[PDB]
Design a binder for these strands. Structure first.
Ligand code: MN
Ligand code: MN
Ligand code: MN
Ligand code: MN
Ligand code: MN
Ligand code: MN
Ligand code: ZN
Ligand code: ZN
Lengths: 184, 368, 368, 184
DNA sequence: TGCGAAATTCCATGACAAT
DNA sequence: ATTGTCATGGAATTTCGCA
DNA sequence: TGCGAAATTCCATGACAAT
DNA sequence: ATTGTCATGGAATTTCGCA
């Protein structure tokens, strides 16, 4: 069998609802399977049409051979199925209640939720503006397994924003207290 | 003046007046019989006024001024006095065209890496499509890979919104642009400083300098036009299509598409190249680094028969940018402070601000 | 299609498929191992659809279309099928630029006599001066002698008023002009027929054809600009001055002024030439006839490396005159009915009207 | 002495008043002395300023060395004298009551008045429009003395409007009757 | 039948434009 | 059913002045 | 080690423009 | 404180297929 490649497979999922930021409530998350590169798109709903709208942006840059998701309503609709067929994209579902992907992807997805949570706290409504810097962060994060960042694997160069501080990701004493406040 | 003319009348040799001619007097005027006929020799003290009257009839150049003068007068080295006057007629200097071409263009090195340098620019106004009038075009200098954004105005705010989305992917070292209000605003400067992005600007009125993106604008409008043939010009929905289409088009000289130069592998688009199917990603990126370094690069063309290149201290004139009706096309002479490169100079515009300026917008002042 | 492909699979030679290659079968598709790798050989019946899908991604030309196709397929003489498609893509044919230059310009003979041919034209709009916005320019083809008239509009009525004053002096055989409303009106046609004046028109959008007068417009604006430097642009009162000034300016290549070519003797203006003071008028006119016949005449320049000249029956395309945003710059192909001269043709525009048209506004349709 | 030349001397004079034609009442007449070429300008008055205005047109084409006239008020004013001085034109006057010029000029001037009279009659108000064709006529009229028309002497070529019919210039029976009517 | 300098000629460059 | 033109000022070439 | 045809490369042409 | 670019399709050149 042939070595894994970028664009071979995109893993997608929704995160949310979140506090409203500039009208938006969810994040559609796309992770390339080979590289672990992440794209994020803010949406107002986890619907087929918000999905199509966002993916239409992404697929203007690059088209996956396969999209993998859970059996979310957005992803199993016949509209979404026709959209993918039009673009030659094969759709692929984890079985219900049994989410599955890859170690790299799972961990990547873990990092994404933690990092969001970490920056949400203190300013839970300002995340829309932070979405760009979050992606740079994720994508310029060194992988223990592969010896490269997603940026390096996707483009074959070093980046102009290395993230030299592999940071906490865990909440400080202060934030735990005030994220406990928010969740009240 | 009339002293020199006196000596001459009694046959004593003066330098410049050929001895073999008969210099006489008549009607109070010194004359001479020349092969062309009999001409008046005015005294030195009358000559500049004469050259000026002749020149001023129609503000004529060297020969056309001389032919007037020569109808009545002769004296030694007339064209020298003619040229002296042309070099001091302010109206001629700022109104006449140049007849010296610019020196041959530079072919600047292609950026070494994707994201080293972006070239950005606006296209429009276009026919309104869903409220949108303009397209922000961002071209990666190394790869040619291009991003497109519809806007309602070519504004700083629209630019910042779009580049915030783009820079989600990566941050570039340099962004090169022209002097459009949207790129020269302090707000945009802040946006870039906040991100470690260095702003680079074209010399004014010289789109050749933004050539990478201008050229891409052409391909963008061309494909848009074709896709809209016999439909109404509803172009907003075609932007994503055109973006993808051009990013995956081969340049015949390179044998690569901008997509390939950016990623080293085709995504799931029609006719995807499959030659590196058996390589690992690492082997693929290795071959990509090699391909990047050995891309064809054009060389500076031959200078035209009559070009000029700037020298420090030279008197040169900058083209007036938007001259009003019946107004001069050139500014007053100014001096070359520094030669940045053979196509770019700093001039002291005798106000005097320092201006960085293309030689395409300069002429060397005539008659030294 | 699949018949040809069948024979090939059992090793029997087909013309076009090189024998030395191994043509096998796999996944239901005929394939071949080529130096570049393994390619699918589609049946003849699939090829045009393939070439079309590849071409349509970005409406690419020969090589850029081929490089797409070659990623998946091989077959004999692919570019022939590619070129066949380019030659039938309507959108490409009317949208692409030409890459063939026009053949070298003609240098038509100078009119033999003053009043044989006038070239007329309007300059403007200029900044308002005493209510006037335009200048009617009349240039005598033989002499270059020029008359100037201020008007409030570039109208037939203003033109007729001015030429009635001018034709008080003499009536010309021909008046050449462009296709401005003022010259193509039936009223102006009547005015000329009433006087035995033949009207000649330039091919449309080709001011080179009115080159004599366009060129004079340049000198007119240039002198006006100079005389108005640092004053307000009150040009109405300068028209008479500029007229006289230019009519009495030497052309360096000719060694004569237009005034001299018209009358054979300077009037009472500054620096009047006096070389024929001792000739009788008859002797003067005699020398004038001689001078007129021996004026320098330029020759047609060398053709550029890659020019085209029209041949009767050729498919060519006329440039769209004022194309809207995002619309094609070229009309549909049309046919050369008659070659009037190597720079001028009559085309049947497939409506079909006959149009007389400059080759500068034509491209030869690509791919035959 | 040197042979006579065009532009050597312009003879000028007023004719009128005439019936009003499009507001105009007089004709300023200029005849080049050497060639006999005629220029005509309609004016509203025989004043210095109408003279200057008209001559400014003519002297935009060609400048006489000398202008000759009678002692008409228009021509003897200090304004007219300054105008000529500015242009390097010498002014020259016939003595009062003793008009003088040249045979060619006198005859030319005779022809002009006769031809006008001839065309005035029948349509005495339409002369403004006829001024052009009148000049062509005069200027393409063969000279008995010199063997050429003014056109030929001025330009050194044949013209595109030869006036092959050296016409009557004398009034027919009908016109004498109806010019006698007009003068009533 | 020759030299240095002046005069003339050559000629690339650019700007006039256009239903 | 017609078609490029020509002022400009450095350079290249010719002529002039002298011997 | 040479030929005819196909494939590739070369490259003049033109169009993107601009406080 | 900077700098032209590159798709296009005939032509010119190289390579391919065969012997
Ligand atoms: Mn989910
Ligand atoms: Mn711009
Ligand atoms: Mn016009
Ligand atoms: Mn009188
Ligand atoms: Mn014009
Ligand atoms: Mn631009
Ligand atoms: Zn001047
Ligand atoms: Zn096409």
């Amino acid at each position: 069998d042939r070595p894994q490649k970028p664009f071979d497979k995109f893993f997608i999922d929704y995160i949310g609802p979140l506090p409203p930021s500039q009208g938006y409530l969810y994040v559609l998350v796309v992770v390339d399977g080979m590289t672990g590169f992440t794209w994020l798109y803010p949406t107002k709903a986890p619907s087929t049409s918000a999905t199509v709208k966002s993916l239409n942006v992404l697929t203007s840059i690059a088209i996956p051979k396969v999209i993998h998701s859970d059996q979310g309503a957005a992803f199993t609709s016949s509209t979404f199925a026709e959209w993918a067929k039009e673009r030659g994209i094969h759709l692929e579902f984890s079985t219900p209640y049994h989410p599955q992907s890859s170690g790299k992807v799972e961990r990547k997805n873990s990092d994404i939720k933690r990092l969001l949570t970490k920056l949400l706290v203190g300013r839970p409504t300002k995340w829309y503006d932070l979405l760009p810097v979050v992606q740079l962060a994720l994508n310029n994060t060194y992988s223990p397994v592969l010896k490269y960042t997603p940026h390096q694997l996707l483009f074959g160069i070093d980046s102009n924003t290395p993230f030299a501080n592999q940071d906490t990701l865990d909440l400080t004493r202060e934030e735990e207290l005030s994220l406990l406040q928010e969740i009240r | 003046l009339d002293a020199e003319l006196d000596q001459l009348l009694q046959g004593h040799y003066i330098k410049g007046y050929p001895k073999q001619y008969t210099y006489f007097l008549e009607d109070g005027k010194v004359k001479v019989s020349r092969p062309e006929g009999v001409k008046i020799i005015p005294p030195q003290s009358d000559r500049q006024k004469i050259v000026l009257q002749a020149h001023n009839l129609a503000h004529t150049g060297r020969e056309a001024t001389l032919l007037k003068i020569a109808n009545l007068y002769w004296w030694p080295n007339m064209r020298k006095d003619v040229v002296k006057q042309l070099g001091r007629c302010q109206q001629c200097l700022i109104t006449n065209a140049s007849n010296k071409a610019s020196g041959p263009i530079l072919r600047p090195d292609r950026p070494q890496k994707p994201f080293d340098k972006f070239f950005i620019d606006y296209i429009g106004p276009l026919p309104p499509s869903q409220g949108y009038l303009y397209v922000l075009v961002v071209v990666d200098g190394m790869t040619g890979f291009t991003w497109l954004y519809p806007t309602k105005a070519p504004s700083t705010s629209a630019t910042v919104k779009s580049l915030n989305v783009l820079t989600s992917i990566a941050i570039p070292k340099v962004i090169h642009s022209d002097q459009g209000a949207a790129f020269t605003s302090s707000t945009f400067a802040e946006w870039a400083k906040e991100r470690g992005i260095h702003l680079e600007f074209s010399t004014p009125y010289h789109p050749q300098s933004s050539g990478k993106v201008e050229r891409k604008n052409s391909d963008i409008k061309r494909l848009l036009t074709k896709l809209l043939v016999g439909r109404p010009t509803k172009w907003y929905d075609l932007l994503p299509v055109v973006q993808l289409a051009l990013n995956n088009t081969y340049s015949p000289v390179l044998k690569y598409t901008p997509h390939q130069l950016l990623f080293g592998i085709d995504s799931n688009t029609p006719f995807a190249n499959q030659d590196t199917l058996d390589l690992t990603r690492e082997e693929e990126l290795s071959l990509l680094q090699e391909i990047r370094t050995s891309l064809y690069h054009p060389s500076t063309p031959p200078a035209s028969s009559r070009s000029w290149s700037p020298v420090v201290g030279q008197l040169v004139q900058e083209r007036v940018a938007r001259p009003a009706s019946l107004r001069p096309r050139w500014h007053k002479p100014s001096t070359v402070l520094k030669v940045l490169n053979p196509r770019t100079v700093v001039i002291l515009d005798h106000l005097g601000n320092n201006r960085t300026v293309s030689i395409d917008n300069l002429k060397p002042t005539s008659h030294q």
